[PDB]
Amino acid sequence: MLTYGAPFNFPRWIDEHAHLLKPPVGNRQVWQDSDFIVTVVGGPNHRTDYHDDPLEEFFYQLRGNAYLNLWVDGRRERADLKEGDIFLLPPHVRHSPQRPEAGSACLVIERQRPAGMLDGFEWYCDACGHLVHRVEVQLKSIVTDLPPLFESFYASEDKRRCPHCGQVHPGRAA
């Protein structure tokens, strides 16, 4: 049967979840226990962590604008997600999504990671660009598996200490 329910108007769904598409929640997964992880991400939200996804990530910026800070060819690059833009991110490309606008909405689609395929979350030194800290995780639930990770990094000067120049990363806010 239709395990995930019948079709429904997306724009309306987005409007109805506006209160969740802003701090402190910021995002909302559309269907539960599905192989395709379908999420709508709002704003505003800025972050310093870079994601290392073992699988591809699909983006469709439905409302507003956002951008992805990346590490392409060993260089800090930016991929803009202007309203109406779609994008497919190859596996492992380091990315840090920035969503400055309130009312913005981006459809983001990923796949459930199989046992043994880990996601990486890392931070880089704003001084020398060296890797500061990396945590690998078997991502099962973003709600319970991710927040503590980021929190443990912000609360630790040790984890935030660059092993190259000794500069202590700011943590939560750049």
- The β-bridge partners of 58 are 88, 109
Is 119 within 8 Å of 53 (Cβ atoms)? yes
Structure tokens, 141: 């639930």
Taking CB under 8 A as the rule, does residue 31 contact its own copies?
yes
Taking CB under 5 A as the rule, does residue 102 contact Fe ion?
no
Touching Cl ion, residues 25-84 (CB under 5 A): 41
Q: From the list Cl ion, its own copies, Fe ion, none, pick the one residue 41 interacts with, judged by a Cβ distance below 5 to 8 Å according to partner type.
A: Cl ion
User: Measured between alpha carbons, how far is 113 from 54 in angstroms, rounded to an integer?
Assistant: 8
Structure tokens, 154: 């912000």
Q: From the list its own copies, Fe ion, Cl ion, none, pick the one residue 53 interacts with, judged by a Cβ distance below 5 to 8 Å according to partner type.
A: Fe ion
- Looking at 97-105, 107-115, 121-129, 131-139, which segment touches its own copies (CB under 8 A)? 107-115
Given the complex with its own copies, which of 85 and 149 has the nearer CB atom?
85
Amino acid at 49: D
3-state secondary structure of 154: helix
Q: From the list its own copies, Fe ion, Cl ion, none, pick the one residue 35 interacts with, judged by a Cβ distance below 5 to 8 Å according to partner type.
A: its own copies
User: Any idea what the Cα angle at residue 84 is, between residues 80 and 90, rounded to 5°?
Assistant: 50
Residue numbers at the binding site for Fe ion (CB under 5 A)? 51, 53, 125, 127-128, 130, 162, 164-165, 167
Residues contributing to the site for Cl ion (CB under 5 A): 41, 97
